Symmetry: C3
Subunit: 206 residues, 3 copies
């Protein structure tokens, strides 16, 4: 069996698609990547990650991002019964439509999940075991371990404290800002540096 595969034919998917993966990205043998997915350069996809673009599609992962162990990417149906695009389940980023958009230099840490409709802006850290669903996470954000964003827009440069589940726009509007002395202020840039080097080291083993 192959771990990089096309999505299945369904009522909302007449013409199956295979993943478009940059030659510089590293896909672990025990990761799964199915369907209408774009993976950018220098991306690392670790063991036990599941990127499944078979319901809502497409799922994009930008350059120099990382999808760590056990992370799941999936999305709600983007096409309805009559083939009507379900606009509530589609996210717009730079004039293009996605089910799930992961930007560039984004870290999806171990066991996190980003479920469409969703977008995660550049240089954001999504902490261990964190959750993003029906939300837009701006750039330069930090979701601490076990935090969650559901049904909201997290403004650029804010963080979500560990364990906090943000479900209302009033709460996301009052999230704290990332500053230099904040404990996770330098975490994402270190993580992206490490992970781009791991992708290249792992590529040299395949």
């Amino acid at each position: 069996f192959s771990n990089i595969r096309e999505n299945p034919v369904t009522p909302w998917n007449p013409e199956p698609s295979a993943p478009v993966i940059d030659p510089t990205a590293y896909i672990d043998p025990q990761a799964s990547v199915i369907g209408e997915v774009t993976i950018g350069a220098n991306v690392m996809v670790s063991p036990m990650a599941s990127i499944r673009s078979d319901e809502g599609m497409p799922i994009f992962v930008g350059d120099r991002s990382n999808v760590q162990d056990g992370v799941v990417l999936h999305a709600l149906e983007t096409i309805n019964e009559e083939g009507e695009p379900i606009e509530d389940n589609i996210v717009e980023v730079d004039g293009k439509e996605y089910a799930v958009y992961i930007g560039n230099n984004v870290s999806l840490a171990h066991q996190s999940q980003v479920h469409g409709p969703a977008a995660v802006g550049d240089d954001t850290f999504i902490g261990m075991q964190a959750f993003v669903f029906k939300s837009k996470v701006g750039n330069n954000c930090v979701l601490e371990p076990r935090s969650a964003a559901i049904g909201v827009t997290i403004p650029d440069g804010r963080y979500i404290p560990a364990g906090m589940v943000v479900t209302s726009q009033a709460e996301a509007d009052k999230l704290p800002e990332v500053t230099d002395d904040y404990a996770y202020s330098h975490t994402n840039e270190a993580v992206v540096y490490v992970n781009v080097h791991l992708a290249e080291g792992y590529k040299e083993t395949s």
Copy 2:
């Protein structure tokens, strides 16, 4: 190696069992299904799911249910030292004994977990990253993402708000009810429709 396997011989398992899977169910190649397990018709088991019936057994998954990416099903020992059935770890459903019972038309969303002793009634949605242990979840329920039910009985037609950890029967007795205007009121039926179609599309690829 095979991903559908018998459970190992142990002091509580003299005669090993292999999974009984309906020919219409789809088991991803990167899912694991071990031991005394019954999988019903039109069920989809996604990448990185682990259904392990080697301690507490049996584990049943009803017709038209779905076990999404990274979901785990496991259970506490159902047989003690002298071979005594441990009744506190066995759940009764329709006059039959289970370690874990997942009913029909049940969705176990990505990264959730249902650990025996446990039962989940028909047409219930168990949200992303949610947890069920030593509990009985009624039919037509909704566990929002990151909710949990531990040591309790959740009455039919109730929901558990995102992030809430329900550990006492007094709290489960006061959970809110699913109504038509509730945000997840139509989620499970849509999910089951999608997932029965995905199982058939994936079956046509194997």
Copy 3:
């Protein structure tokens, strides 16, 4: 592809290492174990677990411990740019340095995660979906399902109630103690008994 593998060459890893695994330990075929890792005797590593010692290293797992389905072990870089050991990311246990130290008779239950720098003392249960990061968990502890310890030291014989996220030393200092009547007081010893027997039963299938 092999599921037990060496870590890749990187700027902080000139000389790659392969896992040192006791012949009595059982590594599921769908688990992943990479790099500078020591696995002790009678350890069971279940499906979908990921033990990755490629950034922070080494990762040790003591005798008669268990790494359940979907558990992740990983760690922050232990070597800086100039090759300087990053002491804040290294944990000391019995005069030896680790990125992640899991002691003996420790249970890492399904979907939990222990991220370095971290140490978990002997005879501790780390519950389902629980999280340990930049912390030291003493011996004879219990982390209930969905609890978390981040940036703290949990004293010997304490437990963390389900769902509680402990982020300050003042809070960890006031955690409750394990007593005989506590609900999870006998859980770890039962789990370790079961899991040492499962490792041996599974070893007899390979």
